[PDB]
């Protein structure tokens, strides 16, 4: 289903799109911890640095499993510690 919406875009536009989505859910997951965090966030900074705990990591994994409809490991936020790397990993799965 994902591969559909991706095909047609440059590799870099697919980067942009995925990084954008993984960002959307990273701020969403980060709002549950301390709503004090802004609406946007530096996608190159590791999650735990931004203020993830174990339960946010598992929260992100639901949201991403949700939208992507893919087999992501529960520990995806730990194994790929920056939004960019989660988007990197998501692409590799979809193809």
């Amino acid at each position: 289903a994902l591969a559909r919406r991706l095909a047609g875009l440059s590799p870099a536009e697919q980067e942009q799109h995925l990084v954008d989505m993984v960002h959307r859910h990273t701020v969403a997951a980060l709002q549950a911890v301390a709503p004090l965090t802004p609406d946007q966030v530096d996608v190159q900074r590791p999650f735990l640095e931004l203020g993830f705990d174990s339960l946010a990591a598992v929260d992100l994994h639901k949201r991403l499993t949700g939208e992507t409809g893919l087999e992501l490991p529960v520990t995806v936020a730990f194994d790929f510690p920056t939004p960019v790397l989660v988007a990197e990993e998501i692409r590799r799965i979809a193809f």
Binding site: S54, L55, D59, V74
Partner: protein, 306 residues
């Protein structure tokens, strides 16, 4: 959010190191206010004997946790003009709600929290050696029951010690299962979180409950709480010093059912909860965050300048 009553929740004791709460305990005035009442009750310097203590769940770590949660419970009320209509505590939280609800004088609560801490210390030296509580999340009820079935079939003594959420349980059993269990949890695609040892938050200590009643809970004197208290075991709403007394003893033989507490607080028309103390679970987990607008009165939040 604001469309109903506010509840004051007290969290279960996490692995608290003086390192994490130190500056707050000596800075915050509510803590200093209680620490002085506590030092008087105990006849030693709690902060100094906490600071230089070993471990995560020390005798003095336990007292300190009560001081901090209760202090933060008050701090939150005054600073954020909260007026709770009902309070609740999970496991150790019971000791905190006891003091807060007025059900016990704060000095009695200290005497109690100390007495139990010491009864357990002495208990786990001989009883339940090598037993371990395993926290884990993304283990749906269907997938746990597969693993519990294998333990039944293997004939391995085991106890769900806390129900946290639909897919989040603490499981207490012998450590000879630890590697085995983590193996199966990852198979179903759940994530192991923590191995408690000795298994303090487990609820299979009939032996302890009797000795705790004789030496600690009996000499104490329990007044009716100034507001309803919800019970971790079943979610029942208590209103009598006696019911509180029971709530505390029951926790040696009756596991935490956090869903029931939420379900019950919801029935009591709650929309807002203030989780008072160093928490990272009872304030954060879905069971709470799906149902209520959370206010984590962490020591971090208390030290935040404005």
């Amino acid at each position: 959010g604001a469309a109903g009553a506010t509840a004051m929740l007290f969290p279960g004791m996490g692995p608290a190191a003086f390192s994490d709460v130190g500056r707050f305990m000596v800075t915050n005035r509510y803590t200093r206010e209680l620490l002085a009442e506590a030092d008087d009750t105990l006849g030693y310097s709690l902060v100094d004997r906490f600071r230089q203590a070993e471990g995560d769940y020390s005798e003095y770590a336990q007292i300190a946790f009560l001081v901090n949660c209760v202090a933060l419970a008050r701090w939150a009320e005054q600073t954020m003009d909260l007026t709770p209509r009902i309070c609740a505590g999970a496991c150790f939280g019971e000791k905190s709600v006891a003091a807060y609800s007025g059900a016990l004088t704060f000095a009695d609560a200290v005497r109690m929290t100390a007495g139990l801490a010491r009864c357990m210390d002495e208990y786990f030296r001989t009883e339940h050696l090598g037993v371990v509580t395993h926290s884990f999340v993304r283990a749906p009820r269907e997938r746990l029951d597969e693993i519990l079935a294998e333990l039944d079939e293997r004939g391995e003594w085991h106890e769900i010690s806390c129900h946290i959420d639909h897919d989040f349980f603490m499981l207490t059993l012998h450590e000879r299962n630890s590697v085995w269990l983590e193996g199966r949890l990852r198979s179903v695609g759940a994530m192991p979180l923590y191995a408690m040892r000795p298994p303090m938050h487990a609820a299979a200590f009939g032996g302890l409950r009797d000795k705790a009643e004789e030496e600690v809970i009996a000499p104490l004197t329990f007044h009716d709480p100034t507001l309803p208290v919800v019970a971790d075991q079943d979610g029942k709403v208590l209103t009598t010093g006696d019911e509180v007394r029971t709530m505390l003893l029951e926790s040696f033989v009756r596991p935490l059912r956090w869903p029931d507490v939420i379900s019950s607080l919801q029935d009591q028309g709650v929309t807002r909860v203030c989780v008072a103390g160093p928490d990272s679970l009872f304030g954060r987990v879905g069971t709470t965050t799906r149902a209520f607008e959370v206010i984590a009165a962490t020591p971090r939040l208390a030290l935040q300048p404005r």
